Point group: D2
Chain length 111, copies 4
């Protein structure tokens, strides 16, 4: 139900081994929910299941700064954060992020 | 200024007017402290948020209230807000323009950093 | 060897049934090379084969204006045109385009 | 203004200076006629391309020479150029800002259209 895809606009490639953390807003604060690293294809699958991914407000933090640091390029952002309300009925969500050192774009494909 | 925010609407091809913007700075105890806030003008710009003296080195968060913007135009957007988080003035004072381009299910943000 | 993917930033969906034309620069002008329409997944595959897709300068024209017109939204651009030199050795190219009425982004994933 | 072009570099977070820009207008016989050209200033802006009288209704093409820009910085970029093609002044005179954000394998272009 939730997929994250990250691309690198400097090299024209998937952004591989980018750490991604997902959080859910608690009744009070952000509670950790899921995490992983992007694959060779810049994709992270399997973050959650249909049963666990209930309506709520979620945050996806993509660790863009470590990615750029590993390539030797000075970035602007600490990370890219995408915050969205889910399921306002169940859908598949692809959160896609296109990364440059001083700029990022994020889009949601909801199907 | 040292810090300007510019917001554009990619559906209308126009500046995004009356968009709330909240700026926070990370404290010594790792909390986010309110730093400044404002709303974008008829030109999509928000000037005047801070001064060179108050805008010290730190990690800053700029949160643009894109959801209220879309909802007032009748759109239910995907994102709650657009948030940009960055280290400022680490190599000395700079001037920063934070630009965001908004669509209902996408946004882009760019920084222009000058001397 | 060449894939085109198109997304709709207004609806957060694949951009379906978008006409795509591909051209190669001739020794003189743009010569038509391939075309098709994006699928339900916003993808267009099968434009060309490894043997036909030689080094050269190619143009991909995506008919964004008809897409927006079909949805009842007034667009700015006539089309989105991506022009690139290929194979400067053989690679798989994904040309991705994210569409809004007054803005588009295009990226190349070369693998 | 009636026509301005702005170009930013997403690798450096800075305006894209000395970028060649060529503007064409589609003729009655369906050819592209040269209309105006210029290069971006130290602020990434190109002003002065045309006047209200000469900028009639038509289909215009703005071609930004992004490849020469990247190559002068030592980068072999994906795109030959960024080209924006649009109908202008169909509902009366407007002012157009064509903004492009450049990376080596990506670019975005946006239009701000005002009265
Ligand atoms: N960031 S993007 O719109 O260019 C994009 C989105 C998806 Cl889901 C796939 C690809 Cl290959 C590219």
């Amino acid at each position: 139900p939730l997929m994250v895809k990250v691309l690198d606009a400097v090299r024209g490639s998937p952004a591989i081994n980018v750490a991604v953390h997902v959080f859910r807003k608690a009744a009070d604060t952000w509670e950790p929910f899921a995490s992983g690293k992007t694959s060779e294809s810049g994709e992270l699958h399997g973050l959650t299941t249909e049963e666990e991914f209930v309506e709520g407000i979620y945050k996806v933090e993509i660790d863009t700064k470590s990615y750029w640091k590993a390539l030797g390029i000075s970035p602007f952002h600490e990370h890219a954060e995408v915050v969205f309300t889910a399921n306002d009925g169940p859908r598949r969500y692809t959160i896609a992020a296109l990364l440059s050192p001083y700029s990022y774009s994020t889009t949601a494909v909801v199907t």
